[PDB]
Amino acid sequence: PSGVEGAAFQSRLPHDRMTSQEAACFPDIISGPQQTQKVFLFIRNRTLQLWLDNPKIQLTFEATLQQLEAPYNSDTVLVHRVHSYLERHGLINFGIYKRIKPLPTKKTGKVIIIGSGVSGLAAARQLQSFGMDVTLLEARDRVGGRVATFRKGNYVADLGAMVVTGLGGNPMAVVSKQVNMELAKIKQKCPLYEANGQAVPKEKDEMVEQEFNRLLEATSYLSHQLDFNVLNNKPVSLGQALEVVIQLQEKHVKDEQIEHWKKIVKTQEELKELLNKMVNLKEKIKELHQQYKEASEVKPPRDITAEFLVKSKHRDLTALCKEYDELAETQGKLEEKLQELEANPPSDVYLSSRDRQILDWHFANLEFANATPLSTLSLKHWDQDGDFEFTGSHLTVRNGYSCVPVALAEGLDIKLNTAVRQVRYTASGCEVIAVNTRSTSQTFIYKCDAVLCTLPLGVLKQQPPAVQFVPPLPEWKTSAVQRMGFGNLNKVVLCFDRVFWDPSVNLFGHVGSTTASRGELFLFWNLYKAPILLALVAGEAAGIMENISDDVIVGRCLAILKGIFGSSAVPQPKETVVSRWRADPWARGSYSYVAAGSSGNDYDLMAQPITPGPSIPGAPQPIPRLFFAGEHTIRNYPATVHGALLSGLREAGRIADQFLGAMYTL
Amino acid sequence: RKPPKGMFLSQEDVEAVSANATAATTVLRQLDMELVSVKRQIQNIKQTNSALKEKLDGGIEPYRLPEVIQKCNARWTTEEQLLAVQAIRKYGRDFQAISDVIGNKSVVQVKNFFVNYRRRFNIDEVLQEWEAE
Numbered sequence: 119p120s121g122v123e124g125a126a127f128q129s130r131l132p133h134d135r136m137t138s139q140e141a142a143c144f145p146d147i148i149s150g151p152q153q154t155q156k157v158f159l160f161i162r163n164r165t166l167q168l169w170l171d172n173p174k175i176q177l178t179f180e181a182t183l184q185q186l187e188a189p190y191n192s193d194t195v196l197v198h199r200v201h202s203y204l205e206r207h208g209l210i211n212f213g214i215y216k217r218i219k220p221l222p223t224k225k226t227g228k229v230i231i232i233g234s235g236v237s238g239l240a241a242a243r244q245l246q247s248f249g250m251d252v253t254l255l256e257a258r259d260r261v262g263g264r265v266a267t268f269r270k271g272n273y274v275a276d277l278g279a280m281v282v283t284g285l286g287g288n289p290m291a292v293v294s295k296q297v298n299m300e301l302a303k304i305k306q307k308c309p310l311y312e313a314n315g316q317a318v319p320k321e322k323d324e325m326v327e328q329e330f331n332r333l334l335e336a337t338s339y340l341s342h343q344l345d346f347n348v349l350n351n352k353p354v355s356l357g358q359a360l361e362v363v364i365q366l367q368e369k370h371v372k373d374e375q376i377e378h379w380k381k382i383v384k385t386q387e388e389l390k391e392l393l394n395k396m397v398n399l400k401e402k403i404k405e406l407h408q409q410y411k412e413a414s415e416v417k418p419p420r421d422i423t424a425e426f427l428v429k430s431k432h433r434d435l436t437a438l439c440k441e442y443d444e445l446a447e448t449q450g451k452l453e454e455k456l457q458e459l460e461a462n463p464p465s466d467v468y469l470s471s472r473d474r475q476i477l478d479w480h481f482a483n484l485e486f487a488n489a490t491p492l493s494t495l496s497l498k499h500w501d502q503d504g505d506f507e508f509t510g511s512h513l514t515v516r517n518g519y520s521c522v523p524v525a526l527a528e529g530l531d532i533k534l535n536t537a538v539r540q541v542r543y544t545a546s547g548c549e550v551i552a553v554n555t556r557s558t559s560q561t562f563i564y565k566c567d568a569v570l571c572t573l574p575l576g577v578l579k580q581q582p583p584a585v586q587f588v589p590p591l592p593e594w595k596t597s598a599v600q601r602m603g604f605g606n607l608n609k610v611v612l613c614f615d616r617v618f619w620d621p622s623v624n625l626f627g628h629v630g631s632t633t634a635s636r637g638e639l640f641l642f643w644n645l646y647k648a649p650i651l652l653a654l655v656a657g658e659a660a661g662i663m664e665n666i667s668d669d670v671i672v673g674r675c676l677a678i679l680k681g682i683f684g685s686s687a688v689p690q691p692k693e694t695v696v697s698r699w700r701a702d703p704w705a706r707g708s709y710s711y712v713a714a715g716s717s718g719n720d721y722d723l724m725a726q727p728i729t730p731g732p733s734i735p736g737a738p739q740p741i742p743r744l745f746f747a748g749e750h751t752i753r754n755y756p757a758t759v760h761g762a763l764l765s766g767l768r769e770a771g772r773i774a775d776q777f778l779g780a781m782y783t784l
Numbered sequence: 785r786k787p788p789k790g791m792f793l794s795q796e797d798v799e800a801v802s803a804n805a806t807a808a809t810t811v812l813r814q815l816d817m818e819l820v821s822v823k824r825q826i827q828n829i830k831q832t833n834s835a836l837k838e839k840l841d842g843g844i845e846p847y848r849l850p851e852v853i854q855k856c857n858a859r860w861t862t863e864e865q866l867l868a869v870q871a872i873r874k875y876g877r878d879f880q881a882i883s884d885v886i887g888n889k890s891v892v893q894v895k896n897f898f899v900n901y902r903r904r905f906n907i908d909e910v911l912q913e914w915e916a917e
């Protein structure tokens with residue numbers, strides 16, 4: 119896409135249509151006549167275009183109106199309303215830009231943000247950008263949270279987020295212009311290497327992969343066409359649905375053979391019954407010949423009845439010899455038809471043991487992407503966010519993703535080593551109680567108008583609770599926490615002193631020998647300038663591998679690499695790191711997923727802020743005090759950095775609308 | 785919509801493979817049993833037919849009678865009149881057989897014969913006899 123329409127697409131907005139959000143802020147316009155809408159939509163699209171074309175400087179209202187041309191510069195309140203709306207909800211002037219207008223000297227309202235994750239940071243910047251007093255509390259000794267980057271010497275390797283999943287409509291596109299992220303594309307060609315250490319042939323690889331994708335489409339068909347979504351009162355998983363599909367394919371393979379061999383026996387039985395007809399006819403022919411012989415032995419002259427015998431028995435015999443020849447021809451056809459049938463057998467098997475192991479790799483890669491065993495994913499919903507995927511290649515951050523949260527943290531009041539223990543929220547305001555992580559005795563208290571909780575789902579899930587809510591979170595919010603899935607996956611960083619892999623191959627697979635261990639070290643990335651190989655633990659394996667020494671896990675990695683590259687070619691690694699995310703108390707797992715019996719609708723519940731009860735009974739309905747952001751709040755972009763970033767922007771808009779008032783609704 | 789090509793998933797089958805616990809391995813073993821039971825039954829009829837084949841070895845070559853290249857003819861030798869009456873007695877109305885026996889009469893000439901000599905050879909009675917077995 120290009121033009122103003124490109125900016126709409128590039129900001130995840132429909133260029134020709136007003137969003138539900140926009141309808142709420144501009145109900146006059148959208149209820150209004152078609153013309154005014156198109157004016158609006160242009161003004162909007164253009165304003166975005168402007169910001170996008172240079173995201174390193176603040177786009178002011180003056181600047182915006184400058185570039186507008188009639189009739190669109192005519193209505194100045196519309197242009198101001200639009201600019202304000204966009205600015206408020208972080209569609210423009212988000213991330214790191216130069217303030218044309220230095221911040222106001224005086225701040226309004228105090229907000230505590232729990233967590234210096236990208237969601238936290240993004241909100242903090244926006245709220246501060248709107249002139250609020252903002253302070254972030256981070257249990258860790260570093261910003262970013264689940265954006266974590268390992269650095270030692272010249273080795274640089276992300277243990278947390280690594281990929282920018284396309285730039286087509288990605289907010290991180292804008293952030294990449296704002297911050298030097300060394301963005302390298304990913305050449306997707308990934309060759310597989312079985313347990314022995316021998317590459318899988320092109321034929322195999324392509325066949326199995328194609329089957330894998332066919333099996334997935336198949337599960338969708340079960341879900342949507344056959345409504346196979348509940349089973350014995352429990353929700354059906356993607357895992358179940360794949361088994362059922364695989365079994366039905368195995369079953370079909372047998373059903374086919376049965377029918378083929380049943381065609382043989384039915385035709386073989388025709389032949390049997392024919393040969394009997396032929397052997398009995400030969401027996402009559404044998405006997406009848408003898409009779410003709412005997413009657414012909416009677417030498418002439420002879421009376422006519424004796425002559426009639428020779429003639430009649432002659433005719434009778436050539437008559438029966440006719441039958442036998444016709445039956446001999448029929449036998450010829452049925453005998454050849456047999457060879458056709460025995461030559462064209464249906465498939466011996468659905469998948470062999472060797473294919474089924476490669477297919478398990480293709481599943482492991484899916485367990486990797488969703489960060490959870492396929493038995494846990496909702497059959498109906500696991501991929502619901504997939505309609506909103508960005509366009510463009512997937513890229514890595516070559517210099518380390520930590521560059522981003524660190525950049526965002528500049529100019530923010532961030533209290534590191536500060537572990538929130540209890541959140542209290544009342545009509546009058548909120549107090550947040552934290553401790554110093556280093557000495558748990560040293561206690562802190564923070565009074566504020568609003569609290570923004572970016573605590574990871576894993577933390578919210580903790581039992582018994584790491585963080586206490588006072589009053590307790592309502593039933594509807596806690597149930598949504600139980601229901602949603604918080605997944606897990608881990609990375610192993612192998613730092614070497616020489617490149618012994620193919621520098622043209624970015625990523626390559628290892629095929630585990632069991633289904634049970636398909637996730638274990640199933641994939642390696644060479645994505646870095648330095649000689650570093652990254653090894654991935656996925657699926658069921660991930661959770662188990664967290665109870666194994668680093669040394670042992672590095673062993674299993676080297677073993678595998680010896681197999682693929684030869685025992686000589688793999689040195690000892692200079693430096694090694696092994697993530698254990700489910701272990702990490704400040705993020706109990708990797709990222710969310712749509713668990714079976716959850717839906718996207720839970721992600722919306724998780725964003726819904728909490729309004730406390732009134733302090734004095736019969737006093738009016740309070741303001742909402744406790745807000746929620748982070749990946750796991752954003753229905754359409756979960757388990758991502760952009761999702762986090764976007765949730766942060768959202769809550770900042772929501773909080774500012776609440777406490778600073780929205781002038782642009784009129 | 786339909787499933788992907790070469791993926792089979794009937795409503796009925798889904799129900800059958802899920803219905804109970806291990807219905808999968810049940811249904812899939814019934815077909816492993818069914819297959820081997822059809823494979824064995826193939827061997828029987830193969831071996832049975834191999835024996836029946838061996839009996840016919842030689843074909844019917846020792847029992848084959850040379851070709852009579854006989855020219856049709858209008859005249860009825862008193863000889864072949866008698867061959868006819870006897871052929872009628874043994875064959876009835878199979879005019880082809882009666883023509884083959886006599887050798888030199890076409891099938892129409894036989895049909896005519898029935899009508900011309902009908903009275904003189906009591907061909908009615910002759911047929912009543914043939915019918916009576």
Ligand SMILES: Cc1cc2nc3c(=O)[nH]c(=O)nc-3n(C[C@H](O)[C@H](O)[C@H](O)COP(=O)(O)OP(=O)(O)OC[C@H]3O[C@@H](n4cnc5c(N)ncnc54)[C@H](O)[C@@H]3O)c2cc1C
Pocket residue numbers: 232233234235236237238255256257258261262263264265277278279280281282283536537538539572573574577584585607608609699703704705707708709747748749750756757758759760761762
């Ligand atoms: C291995 C892995 C790979 C990933 N790869 C990608 C990828 O390739 N691409 C992509 O787009 N996304 C990826 N993600 C997802 C991405 O990292 C997250 O979605 C995003 O960083 C989350 O931001 P957040 O602010 O919601 O939560 P977080 O970044 O976890 O921030 C929450 C913060 O709260 C803090 N905190 C926790 N408990 C307390 C407490 N009690 N008191 C005070 N502070 C607390 C945490 O320490 C943390 O800093 C990956 C995640 C993992 C685990």
